[PDB]
């Protein structure tokens, strides 16, 4: 029959405490348990034999309520744990109906994959189990799993601690590995999710099984050992044997000093992971739990003796297994042990206090303050249990646990949040050889509930500031866009934007509107070309000087004409003729100085009054003279025509020649009232702002084409003028004047259309055509009359 | 200390037949049970014993293997079955370590909630549950629920049968109702999904609670009044108490017979729920399980005695329950009756066999066949349990049960598919009037495995009855636009297709192409017939008559001209210049003949010769006859010019006139090499395609640009030549003919723009312009000369 340890009291509490090992792999149909464990077995059974003797006599935690124990071996195998679970349940359910008291809770199964399989049983009877080691994620969901809370932190905390280490050195693109099953998968899924909220891009997602072939660790090496300049921090949510395989693979192909792996809880400080491969792992971070060794136990356990401990069955087999000595004094002595011994042995022989024995005594105390919250809220002012508490429940008792907090045995508090997750107080251990060849795990600070406080004076002392997650650098210089490289996020590509493009997004610039292109580093679109036209260009200063020289030659002609009326030719020919051509030429010569200007609304009126009225009134003045002689030439002696449409005075003929002047003034007024004189900003390029007045091709072909047909009217009535015995050869120079104006008049338009700054072409073309007309007409008729 | 009925054997089978009632006695913690149900308790305990006493005695099913049994009570409670199950899973454990023997399976607990909470206790020991009543939807998840067969239909099968009724009468919009809690939610979500993929639309799902106010049941009917003419039928997925409330509120308002209700499995043979509300219930279909009456049990059970059945506790104490008697002769007698029992009593006292007595004896035989697989396939050619198979296994039992099948007690086959679901074989009922005041259920066909088998001549007794509850009528008529009525596809609102719209899809009428009206039956777009006429219409008979009379009158003016050479003007002047009038206008009068024609590349080209070159030749006539005297004007004494542009002969003046004929031809011939005449389908409307050959405003004014200069040149040299005494004032005749023809030839083009039938305008106008030239030159020529 399987034996049990039992401590008396009133409110007895059950426990599992994996005494024996796992039964043999094939003997599970009869499920006969293996050998004693003596780190988890007989160190923990004595936890519930001396801590339950502290609480016994403690007058502040259970005053005058005697607490009790039961310990039923689980043999690390879910079948034996389940057979033993029905015994607590049986005696509880027979007791509540009718030597057998109800068990109030369970001090936790050893692993996590027996915590699910014993909670699915205990959930049905309303009895909370309180785990001390069950670090698996899916035991957190309070929809399936109510009766399960822990004094050991969950796997979302390890995932977050690994994110905090990685993101505290600006690492943001990492390879990932994890062992197959629930552990590595769950932890990597948690971490990979938390990574995806801060722009981390896991360079290589991976899976591998622990006893998979040497080819599987070897191909894993090839895979991860590609992209070496891009990512060197491999996050390993791994077990010790998977990492021992990856270090053994890295020994074989000899790529020892390449990349800096960071571990998980699987390989805290234990040396089975590293032994024989000490050179591959130097400068390798882990995280481990902080379970402080309890000094209050080493006193008790190491003063124990075989002969004076009758409350622990499994203890005589523990002595025989520890000391190689069959003791035939008491029964159940193994045959393989010779050299019969005494009870005067040192329990000190390679004694090591358990890692997870701070957790058993945090766990029992969490279960012994649910019986203080209950004993005062439901039994106010009583010594011993009152009636309503006496046949103890679990539904109210679980709430009196989930709101319990305390101080532990190591100064740190035990307290449960809303889903039974204990506080994450995690250490960090870098591994490095400090003295001669001795590779050890050195403590370098702690994670502490999101407060990472890693000590950089002890962290590495390896190579300099280790090449980051550097696949595509932070290349965001002046003018730069981040190309993103569709497929991947982190490896974006470093590329400049065009000149016109402004940095709207750091990921994409936009070519801002015409009128604008941005400043240095493409930040803000400023009113770029304020380029001036008003006064002159320095090249247009010769055209300004030629307009001035024009005004000089009109004043030279006035110096011989107006105040010197002493000439027979101007006495016999009408004077008003010569007054209207000098007024025409004067208007066409003040014009070029008013042309070069920054066009405004009123300055556009000036500029169209310039081209329209100056050219038309200049040539209307010239044709008043040529019309007066044309009327003679066509109506006197050479063109035989019947009609005489003329008046009986020379002044009336000068007035008839003046009728045509005003018609071009009516044309330009009807063209101005239609489309107004307004300045327009011109953008033929990104750096060009000529700001030209409204002066369409309609306004430069209509009045100028009407002066062109007026030169054709002169040419028809200036045919035989070449050889006529008229006034002092003047008539042949009238024909030459019309030829020299009409040739450049026709040559103007093609060069005008093709050229850009064609306004200087208009001023120089109008100025040259009028000065050759002035010169040809006047310079013989002023020089021969001396 | 609840009791157990047991019988001896070699392979024992457990069951949880609900002996007592669900005790609300105080609460759970006392655990005291109610009364022996006798329609669910003791009635099926002797059914298990009868079923086993047919199997211990036939050599076909378990020869030399003896079955045993363990009948225990569940007291119809979630927390009494859970205590009792522990004595089957503390026989398997103790009988395999260490009389007591292994129990192989648990035959069904009745209530479905017990069948979830006692199968999260039988996974852990690998023991098949075989349910006989557990109609839950989610007891088919083979991830959470694995050791769980059931010989009763799933609720997705019933939800399919519900849909199949509504799909056979061709209904497509219906209001839903379901009782809150697992039953109604499950089966309504199943039906809503099945509806959604099929193309139904559930009108309003006012799902309600069972024990709400009569004003909440009023609020159901207050909503039902919306869409009362449109989507009137309810699918009541409820227990009978919600139906009782829904007919209480129907009687309240007096909205008696507007819609029928198609009831679910909760209301099919519930008559108790319709006692007093029969007037609201007529015409309502239902659906029930098909569980046949078993005769073999009824004969055995009704012949039983209180002194013979020693294998059944509860049965020496059920006699007082059924018969209202009390005997001092039996121990543990109830006090509340005081008429003394006898041993010899009738047991047929309103005996009705259970609805599930054909489901117990089907379930046990599913086991006895699944062990006739195990005893064959592990112990071949053996008698009794062999070396292996003892203690009997878990996961090999379950893999021989899942492929067990053999005919039941009632001719129907038990057989499991891969999820422990039995076959869907459903009856139907309906409340109807059979005789004088007789609302009762009548069977009206069956639903078997998705085949529905109603016969209408026993259902509803009404031809039209419930109208097609569709959210719009079947709006598909001849060529109707569908807006789809986006709230639901199938219930689209009909709208009228536009004059240009067509159905590419029925569900979207959309516009056709321009000039291509939407063809008959809206199957696309269709082009229409063209307005052109090659052969003569009545409107062309006038035009060809004008063309041909035009030719004949030219033959008459030649009869008075070329045959009669006694003309004063001609035979002094050239005869060919008076003849080239007729030669030129020949083609001008032929314009109407081949203008009003078909567009073909040669005939529509000939029509471009009509618009261009023929019109050029008909004005080549006019320019020869008027520009001869015009050029002679410029060269004679009557008007003088600067040169001598004429030779010494009239034959030189003929080829000089032919220069003006040549440039008039050449102007329009420069365009014929650029545009070859292509027939353009220029559509002036959607109801006309019209087909004008290659024509534009440029195409018709192509000769007009030189006609204007020819007429103006000949007008300037004929302006006052009218007043000059010609041969008989014929210069004034010519001046009047040009004056009348010119102004109407300008006034052509506003009529060409206003009126669209340009072909009639050009032919009619050219006929009007050429007739006056003959009527006012050639007729006075003839009349003066004769």
Residue numbers in the entry:
A (entry chain A), B (entry chain B): 35 to 132, 152 to 839
Task: Give excerpts from the publication.
Glutamate is the main excitatory neurotransmitter in the human brain, and it exerts diverse responses through ionotropic glutamate receptors (iGluRs) and metabotropic glutamate receptors (mGluRs). mGluRs are members of the C family of GPCRs, and are divided into three groups based on G protein coupling, sequence homology, and ligand selectivity. mGlu1 and mGlu5 belong to group I and predominantly couple to Gq/11. Constitutive homo- or hetero-dimerization is the defining feature of class C GPCRs, and mGluRs form homodimers mediated by the intermolecular disulfide bond within the N-terminal extracellular domain (ECD). The large ECD of mGluRs can be divided into two parts: the venus flytrap (VFT) domain and the cysteine-rich domain (CRD). Here, we present two full-length mGlu1 structures in the apo and intermediate active states at 3.96 Å and 3.65 Å, respectively, using cryo-EM single particle analysis.
To enhance the expression and stability of mGlu1, the wild-type mGlu1 was modified by N- and C-terminal truncations and the optimized construct was expressed in the insect cell system. To seek the mGlu1 active conformation, the orthosteric agonist L-Quisqualic acid together with PAM Ro 67-4853 were added during protein purification. Eventually, we obtained the cryo-EM structure of the full-length mGlu1 homodimer at a global resolution of 3.96 Å. Although an excess amount of agonist and PAM were added during mGlu1 purification, in the cryo-EM structure, there is no electron density either for L-Quisqualic acid in the ligand binding pocket of VFTs, or for PAM Ro 67-4853 in 7TM domains, indicating that mGlu1 is in the ligand free form. In our full-length mGlu1 structure, residue Cys140 lies in the disordered region of VFTs and the disulfide bond is invisible, while the dimer interface is also formed by the B and C helices in VFTs. In addition, the distance between two lobe 2s is quite far. Therefore, the connected CRD and 7TM are also relatively far from each other. In the apo state of mGlu1, the distance between the Cα atoms of Val523-Val523 and Asn235-Asn235 from the two lobe 2s of VFTs are 60 Å and 30 Å, respectively.
